[PDB]
Coordinates of C-alpha atoms (C1' of nucleotides) in Angstrom, one line a residue:
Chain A
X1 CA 3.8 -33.0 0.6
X2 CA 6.0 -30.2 2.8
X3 CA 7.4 -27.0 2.7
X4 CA 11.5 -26.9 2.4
X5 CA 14.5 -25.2 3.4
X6 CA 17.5 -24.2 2.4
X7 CA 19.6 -25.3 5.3
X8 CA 20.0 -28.0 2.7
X9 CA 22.2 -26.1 0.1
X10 CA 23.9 -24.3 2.9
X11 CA 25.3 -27.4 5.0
X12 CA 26.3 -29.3 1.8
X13 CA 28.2 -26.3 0.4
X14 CA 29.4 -25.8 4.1
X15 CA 30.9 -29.1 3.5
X16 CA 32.2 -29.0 0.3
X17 CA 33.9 -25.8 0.7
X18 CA 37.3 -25.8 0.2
X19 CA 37.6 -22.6 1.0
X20 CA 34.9 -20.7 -1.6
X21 CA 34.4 -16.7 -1.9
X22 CA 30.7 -15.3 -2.4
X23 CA 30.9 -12.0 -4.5
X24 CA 27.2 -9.6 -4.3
X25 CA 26.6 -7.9 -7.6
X26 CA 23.6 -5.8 -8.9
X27 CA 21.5 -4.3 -5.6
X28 CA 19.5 -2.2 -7.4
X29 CA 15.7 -1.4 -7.8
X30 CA 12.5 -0.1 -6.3
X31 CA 12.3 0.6 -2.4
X32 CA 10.4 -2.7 -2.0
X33 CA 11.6 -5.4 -4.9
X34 CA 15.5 -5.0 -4.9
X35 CA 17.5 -6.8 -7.0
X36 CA 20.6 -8.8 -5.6
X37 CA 22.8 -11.4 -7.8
X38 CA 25.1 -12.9 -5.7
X39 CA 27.8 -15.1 -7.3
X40 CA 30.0 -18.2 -5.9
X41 CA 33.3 -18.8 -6.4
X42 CA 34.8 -22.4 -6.0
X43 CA 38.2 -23.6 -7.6
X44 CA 37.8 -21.2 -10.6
X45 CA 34.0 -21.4 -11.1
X46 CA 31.7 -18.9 -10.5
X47 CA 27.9 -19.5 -10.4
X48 CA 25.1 -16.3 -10.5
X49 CA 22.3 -16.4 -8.3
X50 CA 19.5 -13.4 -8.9
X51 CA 17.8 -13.1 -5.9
X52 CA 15.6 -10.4 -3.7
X53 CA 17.6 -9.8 0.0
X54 CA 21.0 -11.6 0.1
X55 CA 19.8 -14.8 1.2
X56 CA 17.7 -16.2 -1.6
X57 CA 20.4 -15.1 -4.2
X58 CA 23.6 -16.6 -2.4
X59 CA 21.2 -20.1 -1.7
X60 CA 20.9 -20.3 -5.7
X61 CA 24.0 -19.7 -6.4
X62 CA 25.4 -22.3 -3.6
X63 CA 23.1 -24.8 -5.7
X64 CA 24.5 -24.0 -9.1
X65 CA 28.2 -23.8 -7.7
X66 CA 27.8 -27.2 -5.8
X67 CA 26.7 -28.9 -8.6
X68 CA 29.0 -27.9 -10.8
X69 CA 31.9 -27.9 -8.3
X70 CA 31.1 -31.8 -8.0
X71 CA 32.1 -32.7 -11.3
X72 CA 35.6 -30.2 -11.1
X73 CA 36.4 -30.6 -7.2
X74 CA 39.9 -30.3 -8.4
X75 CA 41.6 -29.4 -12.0
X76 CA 44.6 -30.2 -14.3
X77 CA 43.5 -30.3 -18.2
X78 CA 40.8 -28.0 -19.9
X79 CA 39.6 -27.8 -23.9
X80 CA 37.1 -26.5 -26.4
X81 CA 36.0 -29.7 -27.9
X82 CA 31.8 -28.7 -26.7
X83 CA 29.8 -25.5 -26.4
X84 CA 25.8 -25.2 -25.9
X85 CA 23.2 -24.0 -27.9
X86 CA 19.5 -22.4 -28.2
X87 CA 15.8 -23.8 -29.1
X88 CA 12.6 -22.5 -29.8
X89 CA 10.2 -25.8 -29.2
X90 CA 9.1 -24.9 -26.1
X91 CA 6.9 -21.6 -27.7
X92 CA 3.5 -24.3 -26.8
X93 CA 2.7 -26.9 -24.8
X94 CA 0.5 -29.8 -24.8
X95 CA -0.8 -30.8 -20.8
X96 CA -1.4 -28.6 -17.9
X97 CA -2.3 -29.0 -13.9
X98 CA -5.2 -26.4 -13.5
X99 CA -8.1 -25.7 -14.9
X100 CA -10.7 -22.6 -15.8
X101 CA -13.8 -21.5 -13.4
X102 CA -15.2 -18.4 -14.8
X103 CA -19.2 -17.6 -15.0
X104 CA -21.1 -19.0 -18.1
X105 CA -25.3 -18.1 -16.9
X106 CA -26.7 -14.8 -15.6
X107 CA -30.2 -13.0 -15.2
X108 CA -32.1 -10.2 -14.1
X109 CA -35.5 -9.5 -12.5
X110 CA -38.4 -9.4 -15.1
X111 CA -40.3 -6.6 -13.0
X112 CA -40.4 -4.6 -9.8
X113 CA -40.6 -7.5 -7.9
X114 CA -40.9 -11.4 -7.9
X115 CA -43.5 -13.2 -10.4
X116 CA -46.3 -14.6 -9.5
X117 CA -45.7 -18.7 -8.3
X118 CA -49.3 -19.5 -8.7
X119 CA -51.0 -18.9 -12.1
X120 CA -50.3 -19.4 -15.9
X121 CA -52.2 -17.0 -17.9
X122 CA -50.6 -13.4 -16.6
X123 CA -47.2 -13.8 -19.0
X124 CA -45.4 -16.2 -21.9
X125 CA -41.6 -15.1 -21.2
X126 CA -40.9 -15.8 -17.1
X127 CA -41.4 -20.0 -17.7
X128 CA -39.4 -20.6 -20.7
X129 CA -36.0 -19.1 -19.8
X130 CA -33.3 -19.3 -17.3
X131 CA -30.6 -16.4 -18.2
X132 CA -29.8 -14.4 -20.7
X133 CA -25.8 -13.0 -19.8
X134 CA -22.6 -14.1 -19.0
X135 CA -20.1 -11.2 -20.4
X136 CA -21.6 -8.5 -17.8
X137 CA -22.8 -7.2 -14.8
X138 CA -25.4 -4.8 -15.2
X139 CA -28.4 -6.6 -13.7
X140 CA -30.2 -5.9 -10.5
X141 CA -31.3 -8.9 -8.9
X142 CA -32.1 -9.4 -4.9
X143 CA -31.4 -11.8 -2.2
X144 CA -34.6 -11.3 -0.5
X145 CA -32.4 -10.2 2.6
X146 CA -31.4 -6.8 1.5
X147 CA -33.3 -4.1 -0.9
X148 CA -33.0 -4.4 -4.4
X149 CA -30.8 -1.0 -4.5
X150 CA -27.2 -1.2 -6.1
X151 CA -26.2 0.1 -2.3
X152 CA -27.1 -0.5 1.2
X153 CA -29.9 1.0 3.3
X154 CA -28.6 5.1 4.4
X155 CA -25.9 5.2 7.8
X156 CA -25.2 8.0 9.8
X157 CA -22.0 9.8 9.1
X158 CA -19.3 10.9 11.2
X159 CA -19.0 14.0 13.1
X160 CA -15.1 14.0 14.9
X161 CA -14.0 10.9 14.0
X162 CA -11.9 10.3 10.7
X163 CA -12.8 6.5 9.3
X164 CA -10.8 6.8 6.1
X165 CA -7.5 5.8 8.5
X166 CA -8.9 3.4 10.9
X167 CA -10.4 1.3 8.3
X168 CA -7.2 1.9 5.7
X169 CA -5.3 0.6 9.1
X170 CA -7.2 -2.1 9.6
X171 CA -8.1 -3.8 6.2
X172 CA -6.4 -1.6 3.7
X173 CA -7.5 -4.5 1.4
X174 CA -10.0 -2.3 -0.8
X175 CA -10.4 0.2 -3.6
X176 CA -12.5 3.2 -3.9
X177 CA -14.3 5.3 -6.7
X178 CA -15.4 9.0 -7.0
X179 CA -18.9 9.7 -7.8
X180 CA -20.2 13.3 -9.7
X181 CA -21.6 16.5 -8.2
X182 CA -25.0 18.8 -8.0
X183 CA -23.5 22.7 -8.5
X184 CA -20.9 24.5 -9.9
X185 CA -19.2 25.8 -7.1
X186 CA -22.0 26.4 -4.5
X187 CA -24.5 24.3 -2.7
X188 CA -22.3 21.2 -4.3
X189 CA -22.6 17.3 -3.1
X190 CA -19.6 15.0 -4.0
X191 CA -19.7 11.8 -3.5
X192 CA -17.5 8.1 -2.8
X193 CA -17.7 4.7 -3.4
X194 CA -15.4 1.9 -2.5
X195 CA -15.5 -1.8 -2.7
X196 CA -14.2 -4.2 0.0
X197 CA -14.0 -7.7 0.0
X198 CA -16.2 -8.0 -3.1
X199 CA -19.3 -5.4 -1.4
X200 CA -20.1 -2.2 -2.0
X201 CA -20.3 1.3 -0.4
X202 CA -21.1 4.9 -1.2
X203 CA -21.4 8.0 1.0
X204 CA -21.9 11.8 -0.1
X205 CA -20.8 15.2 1.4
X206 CA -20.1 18.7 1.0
X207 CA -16.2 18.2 -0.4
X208 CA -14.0 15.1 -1.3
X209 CA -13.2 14.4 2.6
X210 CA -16.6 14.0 3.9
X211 CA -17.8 12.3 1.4
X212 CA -15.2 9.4 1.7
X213 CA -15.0 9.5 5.5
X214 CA -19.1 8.7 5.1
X215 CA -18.6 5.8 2.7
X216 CA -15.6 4.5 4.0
X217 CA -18.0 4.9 7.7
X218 CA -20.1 2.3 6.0
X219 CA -17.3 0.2 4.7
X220 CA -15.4 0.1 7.7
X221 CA -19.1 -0.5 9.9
X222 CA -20.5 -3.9 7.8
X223 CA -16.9 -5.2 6.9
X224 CA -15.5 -5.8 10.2
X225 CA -18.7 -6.8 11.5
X226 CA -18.5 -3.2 14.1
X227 CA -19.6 0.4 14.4
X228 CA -18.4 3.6 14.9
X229 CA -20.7 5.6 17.0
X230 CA -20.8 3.0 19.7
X231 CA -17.8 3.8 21.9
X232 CA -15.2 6.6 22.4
X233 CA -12.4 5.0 24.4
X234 CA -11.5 2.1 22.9
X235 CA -7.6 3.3 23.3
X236 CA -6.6 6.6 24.6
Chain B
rG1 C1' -23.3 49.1 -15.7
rG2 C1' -18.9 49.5 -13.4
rC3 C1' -16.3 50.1 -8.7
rA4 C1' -15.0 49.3 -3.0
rU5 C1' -15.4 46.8 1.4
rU6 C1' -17.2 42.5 4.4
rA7 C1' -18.6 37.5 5.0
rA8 C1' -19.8 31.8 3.6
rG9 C1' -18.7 27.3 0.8
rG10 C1' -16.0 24.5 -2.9
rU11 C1' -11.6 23.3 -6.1
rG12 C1' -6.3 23.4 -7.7
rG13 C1' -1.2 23.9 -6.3
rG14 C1' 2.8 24.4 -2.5
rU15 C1' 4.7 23.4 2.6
rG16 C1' 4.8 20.9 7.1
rG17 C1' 3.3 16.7 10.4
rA18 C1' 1.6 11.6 11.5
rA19 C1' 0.6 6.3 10.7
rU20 C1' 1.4 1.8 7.7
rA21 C1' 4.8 -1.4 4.5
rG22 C1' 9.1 -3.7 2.7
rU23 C1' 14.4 -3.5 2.4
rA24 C1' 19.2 -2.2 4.3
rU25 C1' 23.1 -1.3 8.0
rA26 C1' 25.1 -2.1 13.1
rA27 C1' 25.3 -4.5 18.1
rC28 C1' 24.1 -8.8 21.5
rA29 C1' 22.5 -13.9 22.3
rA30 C1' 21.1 -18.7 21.0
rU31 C1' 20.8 -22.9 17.5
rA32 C1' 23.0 -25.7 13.6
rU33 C1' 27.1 -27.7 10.3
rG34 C1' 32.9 -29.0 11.7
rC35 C1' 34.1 -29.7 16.7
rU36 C1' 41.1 -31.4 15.6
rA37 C1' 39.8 -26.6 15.1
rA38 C1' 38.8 -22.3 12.1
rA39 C1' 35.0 -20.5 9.3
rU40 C1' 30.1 -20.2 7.7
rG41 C1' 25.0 -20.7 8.1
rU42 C1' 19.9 -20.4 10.6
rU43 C1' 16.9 -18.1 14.2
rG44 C1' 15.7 -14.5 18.2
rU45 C1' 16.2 -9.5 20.7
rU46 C1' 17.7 -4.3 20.2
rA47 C1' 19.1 0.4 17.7
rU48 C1' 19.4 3.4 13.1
rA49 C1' 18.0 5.0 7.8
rG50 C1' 16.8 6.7 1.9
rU51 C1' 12.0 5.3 -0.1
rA52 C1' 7.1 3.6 -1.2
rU53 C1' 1.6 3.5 0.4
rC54 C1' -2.0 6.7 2.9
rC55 C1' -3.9 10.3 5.8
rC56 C1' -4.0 15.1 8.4
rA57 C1' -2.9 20.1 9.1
rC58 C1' -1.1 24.6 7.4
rC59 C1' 0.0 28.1 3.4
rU60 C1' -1.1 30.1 -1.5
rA61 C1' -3.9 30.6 -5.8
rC62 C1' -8.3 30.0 -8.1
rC63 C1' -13.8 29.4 -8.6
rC64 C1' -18.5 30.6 -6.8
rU65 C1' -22.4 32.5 -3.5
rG66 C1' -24.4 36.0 0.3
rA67 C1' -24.4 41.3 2.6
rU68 C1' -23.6 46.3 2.6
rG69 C1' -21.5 51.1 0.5
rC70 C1' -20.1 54.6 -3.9
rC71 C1' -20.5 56.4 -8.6

RNA sequence: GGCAUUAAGGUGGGUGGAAUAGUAUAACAAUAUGCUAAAUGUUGUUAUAGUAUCCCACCUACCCUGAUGCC
């Protein structure tokens, strides 16, 4: 239906409050996922809330104290006569609300190119089939758009310009690989590879640096639809 | 065969610099709940800061290749 707020909890304890102390406990953790349990305080009872930033974790508690303060908005008798227990019949379940969508058919290009679409008497396996894989990914089919090559066509690389930044500035969204050499110390040719938004570059150099600023130049190039050998003040 | 000097490239480590990211602290205003009043909340603007992510430069060590000289 809708989103929701928790202006909600906040007016109603805002109301109910006689007078209630929040306490902040734990605040501990990583630079970027801190860990804040604020608890409530109303007539006596005091309700945890584990929340990241202060707001989330003083809005749960608010909840929990509300609803219990509603049932002891004032006090004059107390006993022992009840307690709470544990249960383990929740280890399965029966229904759901989602469902699967993984790959179940796959092929691969019987020969250097396309068959033939005209004849019947050149081959007996490329008419009774249609896939032989669904656990991999080693095939090398074509889109008739593009060559058949796991990479694109060659790109120019850099010569001033540093891509590595401007494209990890700009859609930082991607991953990258390291690729093997030619030599032992001399006359050597590292290479990259990356993957961004689901395609795939590569680029080549000297050392580490050109290497990735050549196939992070192609990345950066097809993936935002630009270039990088076009224009020199952009921004200055 | 060993030794000296000179030069090119690559790799590891250390140091320094920049950008991005989230959180936190502090100030100001507005908006909301009550408006008897108090208090609190929500949002906006501004300033500051440990860190994380990533890059760049410098320094050092290592590896390797070229050139020349001596024995």
């Amino acid at each position: 239906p809708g989103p929701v707020l928790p202006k909600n909890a906040l007016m109603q304890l805002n109301e109910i409050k006689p007078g209630l102390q929040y306490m902040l406990l734990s605040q501990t953790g990583p630079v970027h996922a801190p860990l804040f349990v604020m608890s409530v305080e109303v007539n006596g009872q005091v309700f945890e809330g584990s929340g990241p930033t202060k707001k989330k974790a003083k809005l749960h508690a608010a909840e929990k104290a509300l609803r219990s303060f509603v049932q002891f908005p004032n006090a004059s008798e107390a006993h022992l006569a009840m307690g709470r227990t544990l249960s383990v019949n929740t280890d399965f379940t029966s229904d759901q609300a989602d469902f699967p969508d993984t790959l179940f058919n796959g092929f691969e290009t019987p020969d250097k190119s396309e068959p033939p679409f005209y004849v019947g008497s050149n081959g007996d396996d490329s008419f009774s089939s249609s896939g032989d894989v669904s656990l991999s990914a080693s095939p090398v089919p074509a889109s008739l758009t593009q060559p058949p090559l796991p990479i694109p066509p060659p790109f120019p690389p850099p010569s001033g310009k540093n891509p590595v930044m401007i494209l990890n500035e700009l859609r930082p969204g991607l991953k990258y690989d390291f690729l093997s050499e030619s030599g032992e110390s001399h006359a050597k040719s590292f290479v990259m590879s990356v993957v961004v938004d689901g395609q795939f570059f590569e680029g080549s150099g000297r050392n580490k640096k050109l290497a990735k600023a050549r196939a992070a130049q192609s990345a950066l190039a097809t993936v935002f639809n630009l270039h990088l050998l076009e224009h020199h003040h952009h921004h200055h």
